[PDB]
Amino acid sequence: DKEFQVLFVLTILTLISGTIFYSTVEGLRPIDALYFSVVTLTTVGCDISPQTDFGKIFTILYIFIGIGLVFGFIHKLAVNVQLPSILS
Amino acid sequence: DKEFQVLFVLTILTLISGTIFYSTVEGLRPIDALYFSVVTLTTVGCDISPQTDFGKIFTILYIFIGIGLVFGFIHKLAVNVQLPSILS
Amino acid sequence: DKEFQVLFVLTILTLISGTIFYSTVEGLRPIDALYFSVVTLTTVGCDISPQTDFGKIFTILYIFIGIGLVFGFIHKLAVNVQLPSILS
Amino acid sequence: DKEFQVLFVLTILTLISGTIFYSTVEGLRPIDALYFSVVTLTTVGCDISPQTDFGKIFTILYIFIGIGLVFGFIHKLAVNVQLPSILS
Ligand SMILES: [Ba+2]
Ligand SMILES: [Ba+2]
Ligand SMILES: [Rb+]
Ligand SMILES: [Rb+]
């Protein structure tokens, strides 16, 4: 699907931005930065929190911007891929 | 859009109320109070929990009143604003 | 509203059940048990986790049963109360 | 219902996969592995985070694949089963 493709690409770019930011500013390992971005944007959350004020401000903006996109991608993956394969 | 503007203003006022409350009652720094309000209303959560009973009661009420508004704002941002990707 | 009334009553009974359970089995203070039930059923989550296996099993069942009801109540409070008052 | 049964079976299989994985890779007790899978897929979250990189990668993928199915099961339970309250 085309819109699923654009949602996938935007989700990947968002997770890449989060990885880069949290590895630079918060000094996380790249895998830890990626995990934090993922559990944050899916609203799972973890015991980790940003320590710098820049990290906290960016996390607020990142949450507000990326929750909608990550969950649009999850919803489209569920409704246009997972449902037909289940029907099979 | 107008409804988007109402939702933005209400979200800002809700986060301001949360910031003021958690900086007064829970003694958090204002940036920390804002971060806690944001991660609470978006259901992300963090390792911080209110220590006073007043903080806990206010958080229960704050969750129930503000989750709907915050996620309405996120949805309207993602749909009525976050679609310039249609310029694909 | 009638269905809003039944959703409110069911949410109150669910939070009461959670308060009683987590104050007895997990030894929490009643306010702490109520706060844990609230942040759990709204998927906010907190740093607290049940220590007993009974608490963990009950929490799994409680999550699955009460997320749908708590969020039906939140959705109805947003759509049948908050929206018209906003329009005013 | 039949779709409810498919969703229940898929949810059980997903939680079983999560239990097995988190008990092997992360060394959790089986009850703890099941609890972590449940609170992760429902987006509640807990103070536990995977310690191995394999655990983190698997959790990212597990979140993205299972959130849709788990919440479809919760919705179908709450709507097609949790309405005997209509006997009001
Ligand atoms: Ba959620
Ligand atoms: Ba948490
Ligand atoms: Rb959540
Ligand atoms: Rb959470």
Domains of chain D: 2-81 (1.10.287.70)
Q: Which of C57, C55, C35, C31 is nearest to C44 (CA)?
A: C35
Q: Which residue of B has its CA nearest to C37?
A: B60
Asked if C18 contacts C41 with a C-beta cutoff of 8 angstroms, the reply is yes
Distance, first Cα to last Cα, chain D: 22
For chains A and B, what is the number of CB pairs under 8 angstroms? 55
Q: Which of C46, B38, B70 is nearest to A46 (CA)?
A: C46
What's the token pair of residue D58? Answer: 């698997």
What's the token pair of residue B29? Answer: 């720094």
Those residues whose C-beta lies under 8 Å from the C-beta of residue D68, and which sit 6 or more positions away, are: A74, A75, A77, A78, A82
Angle C65-D71-D36 from CA coordinates, rounded to 5°: 75
CA distances from D28 to A30, B82, C49, C76 (A): 24, 41, 15, 39
Distance in angstroms (rounded) separating the CA atoms of residues B12 and B3: 14
Asked if C23 contacts C29 with a C-beta cutoff of 8 angstroms, the reply is yes
- Write down the experimental method used for this entry: X-ray
CB count in 10 Å sphere of residue A20: 14
Strands (E), chain B: none
Asked if B46 contacts A39 with a C-beta cutoff of 8 angstroms, the reply is no
Task: Note whether C60 contacts D: Cβ–Cβ < 8 A.
Answer: yes
Give the resolution value in Å: 2.1
Distance in angstroms (rounded) separating the CA atoms of residues C3 and C16: 20
Test B68 with C45 for CB contact under 8 angstroms: no
Alpha helices in chain D (DSSP H): 2-24, 30-41, 53-80
Asked if D35 contacts D46 with a C-beta cutoff of 8 angstroms, the reply is yes
Asked if C68 contacts D77 with a C-beta cutoff of 8 angstroms, the reply is yes
Distance in angstroms (rounded) separating the CA atoms of residues B60 and D65: 30
CA of D71 to the centre of ligand 2 (A): 18
CA dihedral C60, C63, C64, C70 (to 10 degrees): 170
Test B85 with A49 for CB contact under 8 angstroms: no
Looking at the complex, report in whole angstroms how far the Cα of residue A5 sits from the nearest Cα belonging to chain D.
15
Those residues whose C-beta lies under 8 Å from the C-beta of residue D1, and which sit 6 or more positions away, are: D76, D80
Looking at the complex, report in whole angstroms how far the Cα of residue B52 sits from the nearest Cα belonging to chain A.
21
Task: Note whether D44 contacts C: Cβ–Cβ < 8 A.
Answer: yes
Those residues whose C-beta lies under 8 Å from the C-beta of residue B51, and which sit 6 or more positions away, are: B26
Q: B20: burial class by Cβ within 10 Å (0-12, 13-18, 19+)?
A: middle
Q: Which of D31, D37, D35, D44 is nearest to D18 (CA)?
A: D37
Looking at the complex, report in whole angstroms how far the Cα of residue D87 sits from the nearest Cα belonging to chain A.
32
Test D45 with B45 for CB contact under 8 angstroms: yes
Contacts of D48 in chain B (CB under 8 A): none
Ligand nearest to the CA of C47: 2
Task: Give residue for tokens 């654009």.
Answer: A6
Buried b (16+ CB within 10 A) or exposed e, C6-27: bbeebbeebbeebbebbbebbe
Asked if D56 contacts A31 with a C-beta cutoff of 8 angstroms, the reply is yes
Q: D35: burial class by Cβ within 10 Å (0-12, 13-18, 19+)?
A: buried
Mutation site for A-interface testing, chosen from B4, B22, B42 by largest number of A Cβ within 10 Å: B42
CA distances from C76 to A12, B68, C71 (A): 34, 10, 8
Distance in angstroms (rounded) separating the CA atoms of residues B46 and D59: 18
Distance in angstroms (rounded) separating the CA atoms of residues A48 and C46: 12
Asked if D60 contacts A36 with a C-beta cutoff of 8 angstroms, the reply is no
Test D43 with B43 for CB contact under 8 angstroms: yes
Those residues whose C-beta lies under 8 Å from the C-beta of residue A84, and which sit 6 or more positions away, are: none
Distance in angstroms (rounded) separating the CA atoms of residues D88 and C31: 31
Asked if C82 contacts B72 with a C-beta cutoff of 8 angstroms, the reply is no
User: Long-range pairs for A25-33 at CB < 8 Å and ≥24 separation?
Assistant: A25/A50, A25/A52, A25/A54, A25/A55, A25/A58, A26/A50, A26/A51, A26/A52, A26/A55, A31/D53, A31/D56, A31/D57, A32/D56
Distance in angstroms (rounded) separating the CA atoms of residues D24 and D63: 18
CB count in 10 Å sphere of residue A33: 23
Q: Which residue of D has its CA nearest to C70?
A: D78
Those residues whose C-beta lies under 8 Å from the C-beta of residue C32, and which sit 6 or more positions away, are: B56, C22, C23, C48
Task: Give residue for tokens 């508004």.
Answer: B69
CB count in 10 Å sphere of residue B24: 11
Those residues whose C-beta lies under 8 Å from the C-beta of residue A9, and which sit 6 or more positions away, are: none
Asked if D42 contacts C67 with a C-beta cutoff of 8 angstroms, the reply is yes
Question: What single letter denotes the amino acid at residue A18?
Answer: G
